Amino acid sequence: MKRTWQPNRRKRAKTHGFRARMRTPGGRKVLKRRRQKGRWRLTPAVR
Amino acid sequence: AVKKFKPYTPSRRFMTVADFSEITKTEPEKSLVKPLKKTGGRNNQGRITVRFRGGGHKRLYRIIDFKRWDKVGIPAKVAAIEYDPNRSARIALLHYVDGEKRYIIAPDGLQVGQQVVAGPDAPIQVGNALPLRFIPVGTVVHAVELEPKKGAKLARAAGTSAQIQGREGDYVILRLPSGELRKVHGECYATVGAVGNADHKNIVLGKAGRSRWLGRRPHVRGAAMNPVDHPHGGGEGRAPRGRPPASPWGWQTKGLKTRKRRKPSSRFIIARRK
RNA sequence: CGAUGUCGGCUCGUCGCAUCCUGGGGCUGAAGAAGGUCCCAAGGGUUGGGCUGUUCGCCCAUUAAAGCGGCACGCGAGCUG
RNA sequence: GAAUGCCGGCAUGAGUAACGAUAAAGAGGGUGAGAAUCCCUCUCGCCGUAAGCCCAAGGGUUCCUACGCAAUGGUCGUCAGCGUAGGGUUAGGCGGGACCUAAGGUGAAGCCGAAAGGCGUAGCCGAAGGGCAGCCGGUUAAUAUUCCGGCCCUUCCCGCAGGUGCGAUGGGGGGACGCUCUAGGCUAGGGGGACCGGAGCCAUGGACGAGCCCGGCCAGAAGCGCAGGGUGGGAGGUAGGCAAAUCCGCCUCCCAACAAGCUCUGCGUGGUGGGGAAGCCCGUACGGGUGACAACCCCCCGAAGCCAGGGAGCCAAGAAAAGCCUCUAAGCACAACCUGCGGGAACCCGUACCGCAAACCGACACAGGUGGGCGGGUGCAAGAGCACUCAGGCGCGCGGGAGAACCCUCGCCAAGGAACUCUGCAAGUUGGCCCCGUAACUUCGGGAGAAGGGGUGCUCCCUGGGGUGAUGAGCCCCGGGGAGCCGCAGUGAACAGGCUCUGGCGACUGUUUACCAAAAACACAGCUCUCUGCGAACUCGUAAGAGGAGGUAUAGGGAGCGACGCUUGCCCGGUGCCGGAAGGUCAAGGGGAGGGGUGCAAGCCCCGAACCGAAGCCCCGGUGAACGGCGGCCGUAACUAUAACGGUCCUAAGGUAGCGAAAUUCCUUGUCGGGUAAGUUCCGACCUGCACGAAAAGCGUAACGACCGGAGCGCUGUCUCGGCGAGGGACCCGGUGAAAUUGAACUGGCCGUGAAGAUGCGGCCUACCCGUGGCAGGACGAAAAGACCCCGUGGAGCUUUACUGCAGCC
RNA sequence: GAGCUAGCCCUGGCCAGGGUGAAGCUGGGGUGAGACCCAGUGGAGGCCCGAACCGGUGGGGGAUGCAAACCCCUCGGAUGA
RNA sequence: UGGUUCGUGGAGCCAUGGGGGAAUCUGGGCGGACCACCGCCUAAGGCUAAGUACUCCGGGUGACCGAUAGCGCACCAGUAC
RNA sequence: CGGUGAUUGGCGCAGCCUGGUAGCGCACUUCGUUCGGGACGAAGGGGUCGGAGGUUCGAAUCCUCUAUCACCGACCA
RNA sequence: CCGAGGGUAGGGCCCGUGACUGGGGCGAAGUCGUAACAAGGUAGCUGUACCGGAAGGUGCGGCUGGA
RNA sequence: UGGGAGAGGGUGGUGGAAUUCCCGGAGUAGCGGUGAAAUGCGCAGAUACCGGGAGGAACGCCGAUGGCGAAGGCAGCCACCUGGUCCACCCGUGACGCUGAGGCGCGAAAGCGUGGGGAGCAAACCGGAUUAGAUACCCGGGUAGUCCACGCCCUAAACG
Ligand SMILES: [Mg+2]
Ligand SMILES: [Mg+2]
Ligand SMILES: [Mg+2]
Ligand SMILES: [Mg+2]
Ligand SMILES: [Mg+2]
Ligand SMILES: [Mg+2]
Ligand SMILES: [Mg+2]
Ligand SMILES: [Mg+2]
Ligand SMILES: [Mg+2]
Ligand SMILES: [Mg+2]
Ligand SMILES: [Mg+2]
Ligand SMILES: [Mg+2]
Ligand SMILES: [Mg+2]
Ligand SMILES: [Mg+2]
Ligand SMILES: [Mg+2]
Ligand SMILES: [Mg+2]
Ligand SMILES: [Mg+2]
Ligand SMILES: [Mg+2]
Ligand SMILES: [Mg+2]
Ligand SMILES: [Mg+2]
Ligand SMILES: [Mg+2]
Ligand SMILES: [Mg+2]
Ligand SMILES: [Mg+2]
Ligand SMILES: [Mg+2]
Ligand SMILES: [Mg+2]
Ligand SMILES: [Mg+2]
Ligand SMILES: [Mg+2]
Ligand SMILES: [Mg+2]
Ligand SMILES: [Mg+2]
Ligand SMILES: [Mg+2]
Ligand SMILES: [Mg+2]
Ligand SMILES: [Mg+2]
Ligand SMILES: [Mg+2]
Ligand SMILES: [Mg+2]
Ligand SMILES: [Mg+2]
Ligand SMILES: [Mg+2]
Ligand SMILES: [Mg+2]
Ligand SMILES: [Mg+2]
Ligand SMILES: [Mg+2]
Ligand SMILES: [Mg+2]
Ligand SMILES: [Mg+2]
Ligand SMILES: [Mg+2]
Ligand SMILES: [Mg+2]
Ligand SMILES: [Mg+2]
Ligand SMILES: [Mg+2]
Ligand SMILES: [Mg+2]
Ligand SMILES: [Mg+2]
Ligand SMILES: [Mg+2]
Ligand SMILES: [Mg+2]
Ligand SMILES: [Mg+2]
Ligand SMILES: [Mg+2]
Ligand SMILES: [Mg+2]
Ligand SMILES: [Mg+2]
Ligand SMILES: [Mg+2]
Ligand SMILES: [Mg+2]
Ligand SMILES: [Mg+2]
Ligand SMILES: [Mg+2]
Ligand SMILES: [Mg+2]
Ligand SMILES: [Mg+2]
Ligand SMILES: [Mg+2]
Ligand SMILES: [Mg+2]
Ligand SMILES: [Mg+2]
Ligand SMILES: [Mg+2]
Ligand SMILES: [Mg+2]
Ligand SMILES: [Mg+2]
Ligand SMILES: [Mg+2]
Ligand SMILES: [Mg+2]
Ligand SMILES: [Mg+2]
Ligand SMILES: [Mg+2]
Ligand SMILES: [Mg+2]
Ligand SMILES: [Mg+2]
Ligand SMILES: [Mg+2]
Ligand SMILES: [Mg+2]
Ligand SMILES: [Mg+2]
Ligand SMILES: [Mg+2]
Ligand SMILES: [Mg+2]
Ligand SMILES: [Mg+2]
Ligand SMILES: [Mg+2]
Ligand SMILES: [Mg+2]
Ligand SMILES: [Mg+2]
Ligand SMILES: [Mg+2]
Ligand SMILES: [Mg+2]
Ligand SMILES: [Mg+2]
Ligand SMILES: [Mg+2]
Ligand SMILES: [Mg+2]
Ligand SMILES: [Mg+2]
Ligand SMILES: [Mg+2]
Ligand SMILES: [Mg+2]
Ligand SMILES: [Mg+2]
Ligand SMILES: [Mg+2]
Ligand SMILES: [Mg+2]
Ligand SMILES: [Mg+2]
Ligand SMILES: [Mg+2]
Ligand SMILES: [Mg+2]
Ligand SMILES: [Mg+2]
Ligand SMILES: [Mg+2]
Ligand SMILES: [Mg+2]
Ligand SMILES: [Mg+2]
Ligand SMILES: [Mg+2]
Ligand SMILES: [Mg+2]
Ligand SMILES: [Mg+2]
Ligand SMILES: [Mg+2]
Ligand SMILES: [Mg+2]
Ligand SMILES: [Mg+2]
Ligand SMILES: [Mg+2]
Ligand SMILES: [Mg+2]
Ligand SMILES: [Mg+2]
Ligand SMILES: [Mg+2]
Ligand SMILES: [Mg+2]
Ligand SMILES: [Mg+2]
Ligand SMILES: [Mg+2]
Ligand SMILES: [Mg+2]
Ligand SMILES: [Mg+2]
Ligand SMILES: [Mg+2]
Ligand SMILES: [Mg+2]
Ligand SMILES: [Mg+2]
Ligand SMILES: [Mg+2]
Ligand SMILES: [Mg+2]
Ligand SMILES: [Mg+2]
Ligand SMILES: [Mg+2]
Ligand SMILES: [Mg+2]
Ligand SMILES: [Mg+2]
Ligand SMILES: [Mg+2]
Ligand SMILES: [Mg+2]
Ligand SMILES: [Mg+2]
Ligand SMILES: [Mg+2]
Ligand SMILES: [Mg+2]
Ligand SMILES: [Mg+2]
Ligand SMILES: [Mg+2]
Ligand SMILES: [Mg+2]
Ligand SMILES: [Mg+2]
Ligand SMILES: [Mg+2]
Ligand SMILES: [Mg+2]
Ligand SMILES: [Mg+2]
Ligand SMILES: [Mg+2]
Ligand SMILES: [Mg+2]
Ligand SMILES: [Mg+2]
Ligand SMILES: [Mg+2]
Ligand SMILES: [Mg+2]
Ligand SMILES: [Mg+2]
Ligand SMILES: [Mg+2]
Ligand SMILES: [Mg+2]
Ligand SMILES: [Mg+2]
Ligand SMILES: [Mg+2]
Ligand SMILES: [Mg+2]
Ligand SMILES: [Mg+2]
Ligand SMILES: [Mg+2]
Ligand SMILES: [Mg+2]
Ligand SMILES: [Mg+2]
Ligand SMILES: [Mg+2]
Ligand SMILES: [Mg+2]
Ligand SMILES: [Mg+2]
Ligand SMILES: [Mg+2]
Ligand SMILES: [Mg+2]
Ligand SMILES: [Mg+2]
Ligand SMILES: [Mg+2]
Ligand SMILES: [Mg+2]
Ligand SMILES: [Mg+2]
Ligand SMILES: [Mg+2]
Ligand SMILES: [Mg+2]
Ligand SMILES: [Mg+2]
Ligand SMILES: [Mg+2]
Ligand SMILES: [Mg+2]
Ligand SMILES: [Mg+2]
Ligand SMILES: [Mg+2]
Ligand SMILES: [Mg+2]
Ligand SMILES: [Mg+2]
Ligand SMILES: [Mg+2]
Ligand SMILES: [Mg+2]
Ligand SMILES: [Mg+2]
Ligand SMILES: [Mg+2]
Ligand SMILES: [Mg+2]
Ligand SMILES: [Mg+2]
Ligand SMILES: [Mg+2]
Ligand SMILES: [Mg+2]
Ligand SMILES: [Mg+2]
Ligand SMILES: [Mg+2]
Ligand SMILES: [Mg+2]
Ligand SMILES: [Mg+2]
Ligand SMILES: [Mg+2]
Ligand SMILES: [Mg+2]
Ligand SMILES: [Mg+2]
Ligand SMILES: [Mg+2]
Ligand SMILES: [Mg+2]
Ligand SMILES: [Mg+2]
Ligand SMILES: [Mg+2]
Ligand SMILES: [Mg+2]
Ligand SMILES: [Mg+2]
Ligand SMILES: [Mg+2]
Ligand SMILES: [Mg+2]
Ligand SMILES: [Mg+2]
Ligand SMILES: [Mg+2]
Ligand SMILES: [Mg+2]
Ligand SMILES: [Mg+2]
Ligand SMILES: [Mg+2]
Ligand SMILES: [Mg+2]
Ligand SMILES: [Mg+2]
Ligand SMILES: [Mg+2]
């Protein structure tokens, strides 16, 4: 039956992408937490 | 004149569809439509503000002259009488001698090929616009402004009429279709005649889905709810309501007036509705 | 109570006897046939249905008889539900 | 040494269950160190509205090739979607962007907010929608509407040549639209052929035959031809399309009224370009040659696709902007635009491979899920159904034997037909089409497929209609009559209702607890009450703002009841709500009588009574489709019995109609009547209604129901009452090989005992050691720190005339 | 966090084949005119049978499963809420 | 109303949201209600190092650890998953 | 089996907590009216206050305990 | 082939019967009330609708079989 | 052909008196009601009076033993549409007539469905008096209904 992950690159980038963090003051702090941890990928990797 | 059905299925034994005999023109004027952005109940927050709205058929907004002093002195010929889906009422297409085309909302017994004119000059027969200070007392009337120069805001559903009952000062006294008596300023325009399609009352929708075609979703009784959701809900059985009956938000719904008391319009209202 | 799955039915039995029948007997207000009561006796047997979830019980048609209880009111790592 | 402790390691179950759809395999020959598993050939089986092709999403090297098998593959492996390496994705015309707008997002102007931020017109972004110029073949091991070949188009830019006032992001037209049913003509596609082109073949009794078998196409400018879509043409006047217009719109006489004419498609033909089986010979796995100088002809069926913006009907009344045409504005009129010709310029990204699946989402090469297109043939009335089968793809990545119990999935059965059981649960009977015929009841539609029947195949003879054809043959679709044939049986296989009587509930289609409840619950049309005069009420929000609504009392919100039929009685004392400029009460504020603290005093500073002080409460009325409520005890009538009647207490009034052992009845299996041989259920009544009752509706109601109850007919393995048979497991052999569990174990019975249910204590009895296939009585077996109960001054969810606050409103 | 799920908004697509045969028309009958009655045509419906598609009724299997909701038979809707 | 030790308390002082609303040395604030006396400051504009807090970074030291320890990582770790 | 209420003229009821009194309505009964009876009108009677015990000077009335009487509850398995 | 007749299935009519139920009639001299006949003490009757233990009352219109 | 009357029928329109309600002025301690009372209304300013406004129904005098219609029935006034009828002239047709089972249409009031309207009155209902009792008569309130449009219902002491 139909499971939860049904993938889409349009959905993934427009929701989780870099420019969609930097609208909101919350998601600007997400990248701040992820610079500071040392993340190799700040945003989820989409083609 | 309303049209009834044989019971060849269930829910055509009581189904009832209006008479479209006054309708001459079966596609609207292309320069006088614009698309109606459906809301679904939802406001600019995306939240439902009116429950149980949504669904149902698509609609192009027939843009209607309600403010009828643009064209004083300028008569007009009734081309056509049309369906509006946005309305109870039928609509009249007016070809003007000035060359413009407009929709007025069609009064009862207007027919097609009629010279019809706004103004103060403006003879008292059906379809014509005047200020209220020039219309004779006792005459029924519709499409009434409330304050002048502001747009026709009164007495424009189907079959409705207001009726002039007096003059007093710069204000005239109107009998509103609620039964309210009401001081309306004399320079408010108003369009003489009852509105009609007055058989709109007697349409019986027959089945559930005909409410869905108008965009009327199902309506849930709060007795069928849970007490998180409603004051009436709950109770291990059927319940007689607990309490004085009540909205989802708490306020009572048998009898409770909620007109704002200090509203300055109440100085203009003589007699509340019936 | 860091779990002993509960009523009834099905299947499978097994035991006790304070015995329903068959067997042996004493008394009888036991003429005979059929009964009543008590004693000895468990070796074996103790039907099929209508109603009800029913155990129980009330009926139907039979029977030699249509016995009472224990086994976690036997039996759900056997079934049903 | 213990914490169902943490981490790591290794054991037990155990060579145990399992090895992932019961679509199916066998042989021969190669390769190889090693073959059931790799390649080739033959035979067999499976899919074939797919398990076959093409897209899209998603995945991201999996594609091709050479060399390999440690690990991945539920076995093996020489193989691979795996390891190493090399190669492979070519566009002006396909898709997307230098085009457009939709929901929505952003957003100068502007509004709002303690900050962060929230709105928001224009504009911009935003696409499986609109717009736009490429069809068919051939090559690669791997790409092609991309490379090559042929034929054909689109933008720009520059030149000549010929026409016109050119000219905007501005005005107008168009783009531009629903659902259902459809006409004419085409096409895709398919069937037949005595005609044509073909390597070949007469087998086993017969046949050299109009025999069998294979194939008889594709694209293609202009110009024709055939269907079809769009549109009227001149003259004036003009105040509207936010400037101006010759345009558009509105009038007024004139010409057709038509597709006549203009364009624009589609389809045939078209210069010419290409393709071209079956069989045989082969060298590879994949392909090549010949067959061929191939033929490339004629009928018939014919679409849901095309002409397309076709037509008719209906209500629920069915996107926007750009491209395109036209009109003018400044500006420009040595420009600029239009047509034809010629030359030149045409950028960025994707393209491979999987794609109903071993490459996507499910930790797996997982029986699950995944949007669009093509989906051939025959027969069954039709069909995308069913059975078989072209093309094409497969035999599902463990096998070999055996022929136990037991399980699963099937097949059949004497006599009985529900005796089984909670219940005919399950399985069986019936089953499609044609034709007779069809009840109570009813809202006149239905009930209806009621029920119950008869026919169904094949051959021959006569005969009536259509469509294409020229009114005719042929080809296709429908019929009728007569005679006969065979079998147990003719929808001969597969797909394809069991029926009837009655009651409860809900009117009906529908919705729901994804993942134990699909129902009598929700919803529903419909009825009523109530609020709301528009900057409406209500809702979200601090606000701005927005929904309501670009709606206006025939409209919008809240509540209840839930089609329809006949109806909805009494109580307003308490609660709620509605209406009352009286009065009682009531805070800040006003007011200051009077008194106090200091000062030598002017002064400075405090309390403070009358009195004026809103809403609300008290009070006064109304209000039941508002919250709600709707009695008790005595006596009395020509037998008893009962009470039409009366007396009395109380209430705010004391349940009316209609139902009633009911989804409501404790006593209760109430008591009668029907069904039955027998009926705690069912049906019909009586009323003694613990504890029905009128919109939390009352009583009925045709039809409807995967709802619940009762009965009967048909039919049966449900049963008496079992028996046999089939296949997938179980059993044996070879390969791979878990799990929960586990204090350690050298783990018998009875009677006792022991924290009261003992393999382990006592007495006695029994008992050589170790396994295998089975059954479940015990190990208070396993699993989950009981989910029922109680405790904790534990926690949440809900309610109110509990307390205390807040929003909100006055 | 609405790539599952619930609702709504914008833009697209899908629903083989059969039945039943409403309104409305045409002709005839009828009447003063009607209402109305016959045929024929017509093709309506939260209509019927039933594949795709959407569901999940009853039973059997499955229960360290093919699967953390499955499989087989059976069944509901299938032009519409 | 907030701050202060100050929870309305005898509640001053310091900031304030709302209403009223002065003066310029004979002016004004304060010394814990208030008054008198006696004293102390000069609000409604602003700037001002040092002494103080911390350790992404470099260095030194340790009755700190020694691969289940020590930072989550001694090892290409905020990685694989 | 628990709880809290009632028993009073023939009948259905008030009377109490504020300890002394026992009353209303119907009924019964004598009279009056009408031809007779009923309604009316005038006059009258009517009590173990279920019974046992004490608290005091005194109980229907206050407190115990019996016997009937309706009435509520009997819950979680 | 037809065919007396038998069988299956479903309808139409009639008769007997049926727990219980409704009204009707006749009964002994029962209970409750006074509706109507006199202006029957509210003139009566009537079609209809509503209500009441009951005759009956009331609303609407009508009638003279009363003034 | 020419005259005449009439509440004959349908549609549209309009006028006045009066009842109720609202508003304003003024005004007091009672008004209604009965057989008598009471319920009830009323110092929260009623009855009574004046002025203004809204709405519904019926149209006084004319008017009666009148007229019209087939019956039910029909009443302010105006117009339109329309039926029946009476007289005269003796012109035309020329026996065309009478009745009429069915059928068809009309058919007071009450009642029903849908929508509207609702001043007065008033079944049901609620009070207050009468009475032994009152589900009635009397009094005070009061819902359907009475009114309109459409469609039903088809009755009567529809009687002369
Ligand atoms: Mg999406
Ligand atoms: Mg437009
Ligand atoms: Mg927005
Ligand atoms: Mg948002
Ligand atoms: Mg609802
Ligand atoms: Mg609920
Ligand atoms: Mg919630
Ligand atoms: Mg909520
Ligand atoms: Mg609540
Ligand atoms: Mg209940
Ligand atoms: Mg209650
Ligand atoms: Mg409740
Ligand atoms: Mg326990
Ligand atoms: Mg344990
Ligand atoms: Mg256990
Ligand atoms: Mg013995
Ligand atoms: Mg003996
Ligand atoms: Mg003996
Ligand atoms: Mg003897
Ligand atoms: Mg024995
Ligand atoms: Mg028992
Ligand atoms: Mg036993
Ligand atoms: Mg037991
Ligand atoms: Mg059991
Ligand atoms: Mg057991
Ligand atoms: Mg066990
Ligand atoms: Mg069950
Ligand atoms: Mg340890
Ligand atoms: Mg220890
Ligand atoms: Mg092991
Ligand atoms: Mg084992
Ligand atoms: Mg084994
Ligand atoms: Mg095995
Ligand atoms: Mg496998
Ligand atoms: Mg096959
Ligand atoms: Mg991709
Ligand atoms: Mg992947
Ligand atoms: Mg790779
Ligand atoms: Mg490969
Ligand atoms: Mg290789
Ligand atoms: Mg390997
Ligand atoms: Mg291997
Ligand atoms: Mg090898
Ligand atoms: Mg590779
Ligand atoms: Mg393109
Ligand atoms: Mg762009
Ligand atoms: Mg460029
Ligand atoms: Mg744009
Ligand atoms: Mg924004
Ligand atoms: Mg916007
Ligand atoms: Mg596009
Ligand atoms: Mg597109
Ligand atoms: Mg190609
Ligand atoms: Mg390829
Ligand atoms: Mg490619
Ligand atoms: Mg031009
Ligand atoms: Mg434009
Ligand atoms: Mg063809
Ligand atoms: Mg062909
Ligand atoms: Mg052919
Ligand atoms: Mg040949
Ligand atoms: Mg031969
Ligand atoms: Mg072709
Ligand atoms: Mg061609
Ligand atoms: Mg202009
Ligand atoms: Mg034409
Ligand atoms: Mg051509
Ligand atoms: Mg070839
Ligand atoms: Mg069209
Ligand atoms: Mg644009
Ligand atoms: Mg560029
Ligand atoms: Mg490709
Ligand atoms: Mg597919
Ligand atoms: Mg999984
Ligand atoms: Mg596999
Ligand atoms: Mg994988
Ligand atoms: Mg799969
Ligand atoms: Mg996978
Ligand atoms: Mg699918
Ligand atoms: Mg096909
Ligand atoms: Mg086929
Ligand atoms: Mg066929
Ligand atoms: Mg055949
Ligand atoms: Mg078929
Ligand atoms: Mg097809
Ligand atoms: Mg198939
Ligand atoms: Mg093949
Ligand atoms: Mg056989
Ligand atoms: Mg048998
Ligand atoms: Mg047999
Ligand atoms: Mg039988
Ligand atoms: Mg039995
Ligand atoms: Mg039985
Ligand atoms: Mg039973
Ligand atoms: Mg049953
Ligand atoms: Mg069954
Ligand atoms: Mg069969
Ligand atoms: Mg019948
Ligand atoms: Mg039936
Ligand atoms: Mg029929
Ligand atoms: Mg049949
Ligand atoms: Mg039936
Ligand atoms: Mg044959
Ligand atoms: Mg043809
Ligand atoms: Mg079949
Ligand atoms: Mg039934
Ligand atoms: Mg029942
Ligand atoms: Mg239902
Ligand atoms: Mg349903
Ligand atoms: Mg569920
Ligand atoms: Mg769940
Ligand atoms: Mg269902
Ligand atoms: Mg379910
Ligand atoms: Mg209703
Ligand atoms: Mg708010
Ligand atoms: Mg709007
Ligand atoms: Mg409303
Ligand atoms: Mg509403
Ligand atoms: Mg309900
Ligand atoms: Mg009553
Ligand atoms: Mg009350
Ligand atoms: Mg009240
Ligand atoms: Mg009151
Ligand atoms: Mg009030
Ligand atoms: Mg006050
Ligand atoms: Mg004060
Ligand atoms: Mg003061
Ligand atoms: Mg004061
Ligand atoms: Mg109160
Ligand atoms: Mg019974
Ligand atoms: Mg019986
Ligand atoms: Mg019985
Ligand atoms: Mg019954
Ligand atoms: Mg009963
Ligand atoms: Mg009850
Ligand atoms: Mg009830
Ligand atoms: Mg009620
Ligand atoms: Mg109720
Ligand atoms: Mg109901
Ligand atoms: Mg019922
Ligand atoms: Mg009925
Ligand atoms: Mg029924
Ligand atoms: Mg019902
Ligand atoms: Mg159902
Ligand atoms: Mg069997
Ligand atoms: Mg067997
Ligand atoms: Mg076998
Ligand atoms: Mg093995
Ligand atoms: Mg041992
Ligand atoms: Mg023991
Ligand atoms: Mg030992
Ligand atoms: Mg021992
Ligand atoms: Mg063993
Ligand atoms: Mg065991
Ligand atoms: Mg525990
Ligand atoms: Mg506590
Ligand atoms: Mg607590
Ligand atoms: Mg979603
Ligand atoms: Mg969604
Ligand atoms: Mg169909
Ligand atoms: Mg027809
Ligand atoms: Mg149809
Ligand atoms: Mg349907
Ligand atoms: Mg179906
Ligand atoms: Mg398809
Ligand atoms: Mg799905
Ligand atoms: Mg569902
Ligand atoms: Mg299922
Ligand atoms: Mg069905
Ligand atoms: Mg159905
Ligand atoms: Mg403080
Ligand atoms: Mg303070
Ligand atoms: Mg305190
Ligand atoms: Mg201040
Ligand atoms: Mg101060
Ligand atoms: Mg101070
Ligand atoms: Mg001091
Ligand atoms: Mg100082
Ligand atoms: Mg300073
Ligand atoms: Mg470490
Ligand atoms: Mg180490
Ligand atoms: Mg670590
Ligand atoms: Mg419990
Ligand atoms: Mg409880
Ligand atoms: Mg016969
Ligand atoms: Mg009398
Ligand atoms: Mg009388
Ligand atoms: Mg009465
Ligand atoms: Mg009368
Ligand atoms: Mg003559
Ligand atoms: Mg003659
Ligand atoms: Mg009538
Ligand atoms: Mg009437
Ligand atoms: Mg009516
Ligand atoms: Mg209605
Ligand atoms: Mg009155
Ligand atoms: Mg009265
Ligand atoms: Mg008369």
Author numbering:
A (entry chain R7): 1 to 47
B (entry chain RD): 2 to 275
According to the publication:
The m1G37 modification also prevents the ribosome from shifting out of the three-nucleotide mRNA codon frame (‘frameshifting’) to ensure the correct polypeptide is expressed. We further show that ribosomes bound to mRNA-tRNA pairs that result in +1 frameshifts promoted by tRNAPro-CGG result in large conformational changes of the 30S head domain, consequently biasing the tRNA-mRNA pair toward the E site.
As a control, we solved a structure of tRNAPro-CGG containing the m1G37 modification bound to a cognate CCG codon in the ribosomal P site to a resolution of 3.2 Å. tRNAPro-CGG binds in the classical P/P state (bound to the P site on the 50S and the 30S subunits) and interacts with the proline codon in the 0 frame. Specifically, the G36-G35-C34 anticodon nucleotides form three Watson–Crick base-pairs with the C+1-C+2-G+3 proline codon nucleotides, respectively. The methyl group at position 1 of the nucleobase of G37 stacks with the nucleobase of anticodon nucleotide G36 to form a canonical four-nucleotide stack between nucleotides 34–37. The P/P location of tRNAPro-CGG is thus consistent with functional assays demonstrating that tRNAPro isoacceptors do not appear to spontaneously move into the +1 frame on non-slippery codons.
